[PDB]
Write a protein that binds this ligand. Structure first.
Ligand SMILES: *[C@@H]1O[C@H](CO)[C@@H](O)[C@H](O)[C@H]1NC(C)=O
Ligand SMILES: *[C@@H]1O[C@H](CO)[C@@H](O)[C@H](O)[C@H]1NC(C)=O
Ligand SMILES: *[C@@H]1O[C@H](CO)[C@@H](O)[C@H](O)[C@H]1NC(C)=O
Ligand SMILES: *[C@@H]1O[C@H](CO)[C@@H](O)[C@H](O)[C@H]1NC(C)=O
Ligand SMILES: [Ca+2]
Ligand SMILES: [Ca+2]
Ligand SMILES: [Ca+2]
Ligand SMILES: [Ca+2]
Ligand SMILES: [Mg+2]
Lengths: 454, 581
């Protein structure tokens, strides 16, 4: 409704000036004394000056979509006038479940001895639960304790051989991360491999579970992930170390987020400091792995806070014996899958994007940096309204819009609208005067004298 | 806005490791660089000469031990020029247990000058097998009731420690010394009442030196029942000062507690006379009791301290952080009280310490790592404070504020500042700032370098001191686009680098690509929320990494420039100069 002009010499520089400025293409809108900056102002100010409605150029942002699919449309082209948003709709239809890869990363410290007994027998029940959810799941297994330096474990040679209390016969030395079982649909393979594992121990309370998860996400070929749904089950009864804690063991080198598995062990764990929580959040979202924290009653409210950071994550209360884990994993798949996040990749400071979330459960959010719906049911559609705004005349660019936890994307091609798209190729088609051609009611002569009327 | 990047100088020894540059310290005549080892290499300090461009390893003379941890902790006192270096890597085994504490070195003058050393928060090893000797005063100064209450204490101690691997012996001393029973005499009876049946009050002088030497040579013997594989422990009970002089060097290998009792130890000057007979620190091994009836209450302190699952000071990791102000040194002990944490108030000679922790001790404060950071907040008219971060508290982290002892008083805990995001390491870096240089430190800067979200990693929050306490007034904003860049891993007051009389602050973000340093100029009323300069590491050196892991700047007085700033990096240490330009 208001227009500030500064440089204007053309229809393009007019639209570039501001989102309220409009241009009059009428032939002869300029009296001789006046310059031709006068063709650009607010629409009411143009009408004031005798310009007709039809002769006013008011380009508006536009959204042209190219399009049963879970996430539609698949491609969008935007024409962005500076300061005016364009609005296109994304619809999310939750498909019937994908196959599920589930990796079981277990705390093998001594308080988990009774836990470990039950879990060696749970491979059958696990696949049953996966196949009850969907079709043709797989399972895997890994175990962790902590790094093997002071004061995280006791480094006294006897306690390195038996980190458990001295009574224990069947006990294994502490270790960072052991990859026990590749992802397989065979239970008895799970049973023989997981049955080979022994209990262990360590010294100070928190544990290197985050080291192990970083290895699970950084070694996709060793774990054997399919390009399907990926669940990582984190079962523990203690807290966790993160970056900065390694300083007590004189480990000052940050985690590099690379696969350091050798012989299915994380051998260089004493070289690298623990990962930061966010570093793990970044790696889990890249590889589309969704963690499920199965923690005892005393750890629940702590691991709940992790879900504020890692969007696709779930917490469940594990029993002291890890017996209820199968009912915990189902409840967690339900919590993960019934909530949807619609986010975009990294953007420049020039573009701004917001999301109106129209959810099926009868709840509406508007103008948010991220689309968020919960209560999502299978084949019950939900609509996201995306509003993209450009601050200036933009260079050609493209970004993607993802449904978090899924690889399906919406490719958004962003194009500027800095040009006016005017009229009258013809009618009389009669004019400039000197050799040179017309564009938008103001001649732009061919090089060769130039000037104005030509 | 004015640090001459184009004139940047880089320093690096030929054998330097990756953690050369973990701590940088500017003391006139050059830079001190900490170089904690990596792998099986040990740690070292480096004196970097300003003119030569050569960094040389520092030799610690009289240093008996040096670990991978050396150079992890560097600090200096601006008031007197002292340098404190600590080595939190003193690891030893006590039975099947490993202990972890620190070894701190103080350079009053310079690195080439005289060195002091102590072991803050160090727990001596009491093994399962202990040979304990009671050495009790029989002087004429003891009323027959007091001398009786001393024998009752020895009996009650042995009664508590029957059915342990402790074996006992007792020696009365006055002018001479008599073994009341040997270790084998305890093996044949385990009767504290029948072993002291024959003891008779000597009623003579108090000769402590010769008594301790007597116990060293004559009482600890195999033929008298002393196990050579056992920890030797001596407990001295005396009601006055010693009537002889000399040295107990023969008894150095023995752990010595000493208990002064009664009116003769009312003056503090008479209490410090007991210090030389006992082990260090004196705060642990010297017990002053004003009355004799307090010998019965004492059982909890002196029985208990003499395959763990619950820890006090064994894994204290003392000296993992330090700060010095006005001749007063503190080191943090993150492992104390089951990694609840705390800090140690050090005697100026490093021969004694005092532990200050969380109060109360709840399950919630455990594994919080209090003392990961320590920063003095001095002031003249207002009271001086000590802020310590517990970056792991409840997995979110917090910062506690302690007030110096006032008058007779002790340390008090005056405020708590909690973090709101898990794993953010809120309080993993602290920095006191006095913007306008009035002698009053108004600002507490708190780092949360692992903070995640909103397309920038790490945060620095600005707290200002009010009448009630520290209030959050602002935040130092770093550039977005590095969500894991760890903005806030290093925060230092830079003195004044634009010559406007207002102190400026640097913040390192060592994981933003190859590292960066943000300069925040001080304004009137506080700090500017927006940076005036951002130094990328890639500009200074091509292969550089972790640029900004450690920052220290000072007004340097030989050379061209306003201020000099030393910034550490991976294998590198870099000096920048402030200019009027
Ligand atoms: C505009 O009007 C002028 C006379 O006022 C005339 O010379 C010129 O040809 C006109 N231009 C057009 C494009 O009609
Ligand atoms: C998207 O759908 C909503 C209803 O869910 C509708 O109100 C809106 O008009 C649509 N968006 C656009 C840009 O038309
Ligand atoms: C396990 O997976 C393989 C790979 O697709 C498949 O060929 C095999 O039939 C599966 N085993 C079953 C379904 O029992
Ligand atoms: C270092 O320890 C040795 C014994 O190993 C001892 O002889 C020496 O006096 C100690 N050094 C200092 C400075 O106390
Ligand atoms: Ca259990
Ligand atoms: Ca541990
Ligand atoms: Ca001030
Ligand atoms: Ca300044
Ligand atoms: Mg006496």
């Amino acid at each position: 409704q208001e227009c500030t002009k500064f440089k204007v010499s053309s229809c393009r520089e007019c639209i570039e000036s501001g989102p309220g400025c409009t241009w009059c293409q009428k032939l002869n809108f300029t009296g001789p004394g006046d310059p031709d900056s006068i063709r650009c102002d607010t629409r009411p100010q143009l009408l004031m000056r005798g310009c007709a409605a039809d002769d006013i150029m008011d380009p508006t942002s536009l959204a042209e979509t190219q399009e049963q699919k879970q996430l539609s449309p698949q491609k969008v082209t935007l024409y962005l006038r500076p300061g005016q948003a364009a609005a296109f709709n994304v619809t999310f239809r939750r498909a019937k479940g994908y196959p599920i890869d589930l990796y079981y990363l277990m705390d093998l410290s001594y308080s988990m001895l009774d836990d470990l007994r039950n879990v060696k027998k749970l491979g059958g029940d696990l696949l049953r639960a996966l196949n009850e959810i969907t079709e043709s799941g797989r399972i895997g297994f890994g175990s962790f304790v902590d790094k093997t330096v002071l004061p995280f474990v006791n480094t006294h040679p006897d306690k390195l051989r038996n980190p458990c209390p001295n009574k224990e016969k069947e006990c294994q030395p502490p270790f960072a991360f052991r990859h026990v079982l590749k992802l397989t649909n065979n239970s008895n393979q799970f049973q023989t491999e997981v049955g080979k594992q022994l209990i262990s121990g360590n010294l100070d309370a928190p544990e290197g579970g985050l080291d192990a998860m970083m290895q699970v996400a950084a070694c996709p070929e060793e774990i054997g992930w399919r390009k399907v749904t990926r669940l990582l089950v984190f079962a523990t009864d203690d807290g966790f170390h993160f970056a900065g804690d390694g300083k007590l063991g004189a480990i000052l080198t940050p985690n590099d987020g690379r696969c350091h598995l050798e012989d299915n062990l994380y051998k260089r764990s004493n070289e690298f400091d623990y990962p930061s929580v966010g570093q793990l959040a970044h790696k889990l979202a890249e590889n589309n792995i969704q963690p499920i924290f199965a923690v005892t009653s005393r750890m629940v409210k702590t691991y709940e806070k992790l879900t504020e950071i890692i969007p696709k994550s779930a917490v469940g209360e594990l029993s002291e014996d890890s017996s209820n884990v199968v009912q915990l994993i189902k409840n967690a798949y339900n919590k993960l899958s019934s909530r949807v996040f619609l986010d975009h990749n990294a953007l420049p400071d020039t573009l701004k994007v917001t999301y109106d979330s129209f959810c099926s459960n009868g709840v509406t959010h508007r103008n948010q940096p991220r689309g968020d719906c919960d209560g999502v049911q299978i084949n019950v559609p939900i609509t996201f309204q995306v509003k993209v705004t450009a601050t200036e005349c933009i260079q050609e660019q493209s970004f993607v819009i993802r449904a978090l936890g899924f690889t399906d994307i919406v490719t958004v091609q962003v194009l500027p609208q800095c040009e006016c798209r005017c009229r009258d190729q013809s009618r009389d088609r009669s004019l400039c005067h000197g050799k040179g051609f017309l564009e938008c009611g103001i001649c732009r002569c061919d090089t060769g004298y130039i000037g104005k009327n030509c | 806005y004015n640090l001459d990047v184009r004139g940047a100088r880089s320093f690096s020894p030929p054998r330097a490791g990756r953690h050369f540059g973990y701590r940088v310290l500017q003391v006139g005549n050059g830079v001190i660089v900490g170089a904690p080892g990596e792998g099986n290499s040990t740690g070292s300090l480096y004196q970097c000469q300003s003119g030569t461009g050569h960094c040389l390893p520092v030799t610690l003379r009289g240093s008996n031990y040096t670990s991978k941890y050396l150079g992890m902790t560097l600090a200096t006192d601006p008031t007197d020029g002292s340098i404190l270096a600590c080595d939190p890597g003193l690891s030893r085994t006590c039975d099947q247990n490993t202990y972890l504490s620190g070894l701190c070195y103080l350079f009053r003058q310079n690195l080439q000058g005289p060195m002091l050393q102590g072991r803050p928060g160090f727990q001596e090893c009491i093994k399962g097998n202990v040979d304990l000797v009671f050495l009790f005063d029989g002087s004429m100064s003891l009323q027959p009731d007091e001398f009786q209450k001393i024998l009752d204490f020895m009996k009650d101690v042995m009664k508590k420690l029957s059915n342990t691997s402790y074996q006992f012996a007792a020696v009365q001393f006055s002018t001479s010394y008599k073994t009341e029973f040997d270790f084998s005499d305890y093996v044949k009876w385990k009767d504290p009442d029948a072993l002291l049946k024959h003891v008779k009050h000597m009623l003579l002088l108090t000769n402590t030196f010769g008594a301790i030497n007597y116990v060293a040579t004559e009482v600890f013997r195999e033929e008298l029942g002393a196990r050579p594989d056992a920890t030797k422990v001596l407990i001295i009970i005396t009601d006055g000062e010693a009537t002889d002089s000399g040295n107990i060097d023969a008894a150095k290998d023995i752990i010595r507690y000493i208990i002064g009792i009664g009116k003769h130890f009312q003056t503090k000057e008479s209490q410090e006379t007991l210090h030389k007979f006992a082990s260090k620190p004196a705060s642990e091994f010297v017990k002053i009791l004003d009355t004799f009836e307090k010998l019965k209450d004492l059982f909890t302190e002196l029985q208990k301290k003499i395959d763990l699952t619950s820890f006090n000071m064994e894994l204290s990791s003392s000296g993992i952080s330090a700060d010095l102000s006005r001749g007063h040194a503190v080191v943090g002990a993150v492992g104390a009280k089951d990694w609840a944490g705390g800090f140690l108030d050090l005697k100026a000679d490093l021969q004694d310490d005092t532990f200050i922790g969380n109060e109360p001790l709840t399950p919630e404060v455990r594994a919080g790592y209090l003392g990961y950071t320590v920063t003095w907040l001095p002031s003249r008219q207002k009271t001086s404070l000590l802020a310590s971060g517990a970056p792991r508290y409840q997995h979110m982290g917090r910062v506690l504020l302690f007030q110096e002892p006032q008058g007779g008083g002790h340390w008090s805990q005056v405020q708590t500042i909690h973090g709101t995001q898990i794993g953010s390491y809120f309080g993993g870096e602290l920095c006191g700032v006095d913007v306008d240089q009035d002698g009053e430190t108004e600002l507490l800067l708190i780092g949360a370098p692992l903070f995640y979200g909103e397309q920038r990693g790490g945060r620095v929050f600005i707290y200002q001191r009010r009448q009630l306490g520290f209030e959050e007034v602002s935040e130092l904003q770093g550039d977005p686009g590095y969500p894991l860049g760890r903005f806030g891993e290093a925060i230092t007051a830079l003195t004044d680098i634009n010559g406007d009389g207002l102190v400026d602050v640097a913040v390192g973000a060592p994981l933003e690509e190859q590292g960066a340093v943000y300069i925040f100029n001080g304004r009137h009323g506080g700090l500017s929320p927006q940076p005036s300069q951002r130094i990328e590491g890639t500009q200074v050196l091509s292969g550089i990494q972790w640029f900004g892991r450690s920052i220290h700047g000072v007004k340097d007085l030989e050379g061209d420039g306003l201020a000099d700033v030393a910034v550490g990096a991976e294998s590198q240490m870099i000096v920048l100069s402030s200019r009027p330009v």
